[PDB]
């Protein structure tokens, strides 16, 4: 014979988005998402060329553009570290 069973547990979902936000002059970091402060200055990457904080700029790497390793962002450091550059230029 056949013995079926109906009855599923579902939940309503409808999250609303409403929060004053604006990033024109790099109000906050583009990674950690933290409020910039006097002590926490900003750092303009040399590769990606973006705005980041000290926490997101505590790494250096020797790029093919510059002779010596400059201060880069974790987004570039880790990336370049987990990438494959076989004479790409």
Binding-site string for Zn ion from residue 26 to residue 65, where x marks contact by CB under 5 A and - marks none = ---x-xx------------x-xx----x-xx---------
Position among 3, 21, 76, 82 found at the interface with Zn ion (CB under 5 A): 76
Q: Considering beta carbons, is residue 27 or 55 the nearer one to Zn ion?
A: 55
- Asked if residue 84 belongs to a known ligand binding site, the reply is no
* Rounded Cα distance, 30 and 79, in Å: 16
Q: Which secondary structure element, helix H or strand E, spans residue 61, and what is its range? A: strand 59-61
Structural tokens at position 52: 């980041």
Which residues 6+ apart lie within 8 Å of 28 measured at CB? 34, 35, 36
- Asked if residue 76 belongs to a known ligand binding site, the reply is yes
Residue 46 near residue 63, CB atoms below 8 Å:
yes
Question: Which residues line the annotated binding site for Zn(2+)?
Answer: 29, 32, 45, 48, 53, 56, 73, 76
| Interacting residues with Zn ion (CB under 5 A) | 29, 31-32, 45, 47-48, 53, 55-56, 73, 75-76
């Amino acid at each position: 014979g056949s013995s079926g069973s109906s009855g599923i547990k579902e939940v309503n979902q409808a999250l609303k988005g409403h929060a004053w936000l604006k990033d024109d002059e790099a109000t906050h970091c583009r990674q950690c998402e933290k409020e910039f402060s006097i002590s926490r200055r900003k750092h303009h990457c040399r590769n990606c060329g973006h705005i980041f904080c000290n926490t997101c700029s505590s790494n250096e790497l020797a790029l093919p553009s510059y002779p010596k390793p400059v201060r880069v962002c974790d987004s570039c450091h880790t990336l370049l570290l987990q990438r494959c550059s076989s004479t790409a230029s």
